[PDB]
Amino acid sequence: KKSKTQRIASAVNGLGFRLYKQVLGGAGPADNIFFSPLSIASALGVVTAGANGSTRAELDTALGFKSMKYFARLNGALYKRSAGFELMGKNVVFSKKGLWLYRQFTRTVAHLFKSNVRSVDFGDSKNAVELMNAYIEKVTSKKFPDVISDVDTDTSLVIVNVIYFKGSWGNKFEPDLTKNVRFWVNSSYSMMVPTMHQRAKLSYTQDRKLRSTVVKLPYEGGASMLVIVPHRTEDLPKVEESVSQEQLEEWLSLLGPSNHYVQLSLPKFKISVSYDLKAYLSAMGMSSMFSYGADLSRITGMQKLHVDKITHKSVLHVNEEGTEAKAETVVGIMA
Amino acid sequence: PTVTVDRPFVVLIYDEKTRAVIFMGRVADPK
């Protein structure tokens, strides 16, 4: 939609949805799916800033549309702290201690991603992991310890995004109204899930086209959780197939104020998911940066660098107060 | 007028002004 921040937000969403669709290729219908498009876009923006040639191109096409200048504006607009709301995002870039970096690279990462580059002796790797994690933790008031598990000697850089969200519901649930209820994974496999309960004024609608219920759960801040429940859990692939920016706008238009009171029943849970994204991003067109013929020559000429590895790890905690959510994207660069 | 999230569901946490999606997913198995 028209605004500058809105265009880049839909690019990032576009990236997210495209990624979602790849995740489905390897997810049994009992699996949890959870990831932050912003975290992943931030980490890849850093890689983009050092890319050249075919590698840069593939990466620009995936991240869409001074393209990256309005990405930092978006993050500035989103990351805020106020009563019952926190969204915080941090990029960190570690570099090999001997390794000369071009200044145009270090300054665009300081300006667009707010990271100064910290150098590290990855050769002494036990300590290298403790040092990196200790730095990350220092800068994120202990929300993110242990973001890094392992680091190769021949590692030349590691790029890190983390993102933390904690939102209070606009309508907080009463703990007194929380009893176990059969949650149906399936037609056959059920389980007892502490399920929360409230009568509040929530926007909802039946999606007739997708045979599923949509509901908007506001947080404090200007944020909310959209929850989409297929009626038959066999409708779930056609729901998950349609996800797109246009579908999102669809679901948001179909939502009215609809502010007569609603009877809501919602699970209380903490789930966490991990990914290795190499194959998914490869399918989405960014296969180049993992080759031994990758071009990351804007980073340094001293060595020929490629992306070794990209992990993404995320956690979702829903309870009576609200929602707590973390994500962490890590990129390892080698020769 | 009733919403029961008793089955697998898609979940999106997003900013209203920018429509920026911050987390995406599907919850099929709480813990």
Please compute, for residue A60, the number of CA atoms within 13 A of its CA located in the half-sphere on the CB side: 11
* A249–B1 C-beta distance less than 8 A: no
A252-289: burial string, b at 16+ Cβ within 10 Å, e else: eebbeeeeeebebbbbbbebebebebbebbeebebbbb
Distance in angstroms (rounded) separating the CA atoms of residues A287 and A252: 34
CA nearest B21 in A: which residue? A13
3-state secondary structure (DSSP) of residue A268 = coil
CA distance B14 to chain A (A): 6
Q: Which two tokens stand for residue A126?
A: 């036990």
Q: Which CATH superfamily does the domain covering A169-266+326-335 fall into?
A: Alpha-1-antitrypsin, domain 1 (2.30.39.10)
Could you give phi then psi for residue B22, rounded to 5 degrees? -100, -40
Cβ-Cβ contacts under 8 Å for A141 (sequence gap 6 or more)? none
**DSSP string for A281-293:** HIIIII-GGGSTT
* B21–A223 C-beta distance less than 8 A: no
* B19–A252 C-beta distance less than 8 A: yes
| CB neighbourhood size of A30 (10 A) | 11
Cβ proximity of A28 and A237 under 8 Å: no
| A29 contact residues in B (CB cutoff 8 A) | 8, 28
| A34 contact residues in B (CB cutoff 8 A) | 11, 23-27
**DSSP string for A306-317:** EEEEEEEEEEEE
**DSSP string for A1-54:** --SHHHHHHHHHHHHHHHHHHHHGGG--TT--EEE-HHHHHHHHHHHHHT--HH
Technique of determination: X-ray
Residue with tokens 């599923």: A212
A-proximal residues of B, 2-31, CB under 8 Å: 2-31
**Among B9, B15, B17, beta carbon nearest to A227:** B9
In chain A, residues under CATH classification 3.30.497.10 are 1-168+267-320
Q: Please report, as a single letter, which amino acid is at residue A172.
A: K
B-proximal residues of A, 70-99, CB under 8 Å: 74, 77-78, 87
Q: Please give the angle made by the CA atoms of A32, A184 and B13, to the nearest 5 degrees.
A: 40
Characterise A200 by phi-psi region: left (phi > 0), alpha (psi -120 to 50), beta (else): beta
Cβ-Cβ contacts under 8 Å for A116 (sequence gap 6 or more)? A93, A106, A110
**Into how many domains does chain B fold?**
1
CA distance A159 to chain B (A): 19
Distance in angstroms (rounded) separating the CA atoms of residues A44 and A62: 10
Cβ-Cβ contacts under 8 Å for A309 (sequence gap 6 or more)? A276, A278, A330, A331, A332
CA nearest A17 in B: which residue? B24
| CB neighbourhood size of A220 (10 A) | 17
Cβ-Cβ contacts under 8 Å for A6 (sequence gap 6 or more)? B18, B19
Cβ proximity of A224 and A251 under 8 Å: no
**DSSP string for A319-331:** -SSEEEEEEEEEE
* B11–A225 C-beta distance less than 8 A: yes
Cβ-Cβ contacts under 8 Å for A133 (sequence gap 6 or more)? A145, A146, A147, A148
Q: Single out the residue of A312, A333, A332 nearest to residue A37, CA to CA.
A: A312
Residues pairing with A259 in the sheet: none
**Among B1, B6, B21, beta carbon nearest to A13:** B21
For residues A253, A258, A262 and A268, what is the CA-based torsion angle, rounded to 10 degrees?
A: 30
* Residue A201 CA: distances (Å) to CA of A94, A170, A176, A259, A261: 47, 10, 19, 5, 4
* B10–A240 C-beta distance less than 8 A: yes
Q: Please give the angle made by the CA atoms of A102, A103 and A104, to the nearest 5 degrees.
A: 95
B-proximal residues of A, 132-161, CB under 8 Å: none
In chain A, residues under CATH classification 2.30.39.10 are 169-266+326-335
| B23 contact residues in A (CB cutoff 8 A) | 34-36, 165, 314, 316, 325, 327
Distance in angstroms (rounded) separating the CA atoms of residues A237 and A20: 12
Distance in angstroms (rounded) separating the CA atoms of residues A36 and A330: 13
CA distance A98 to chain B (A): 36
Q: Is A182 on the interface with B (CB under 8 A)?
A: yes
**CATH top class, domain A1-168+267-320:** alpha beta
Q: Please give the angle made by the CA atoms of A315, A129 and A151, to the nearest 5 degrees.
A: 90
- Interface size, chain A vs chain B, as Cβ–Cβ contacts under 8 Å: 185
- What sign does the CA torsion over A322, A6, A228, A257 have? positive
For residues A55, A61, A65 and A70, what is the CA-based torsion angle, rounded to 10 degrees?
A: -30
Q: Is A202 on the interface with B (CB under 8 A)?
A: yes
Distance in angstroms (rounded) separating the CA atoms of residues A246 and A112: 28
Q: Which domain holds residue B31?
A: 1-31
Helix and strand numbers (H, E) in chain B are 0, 3
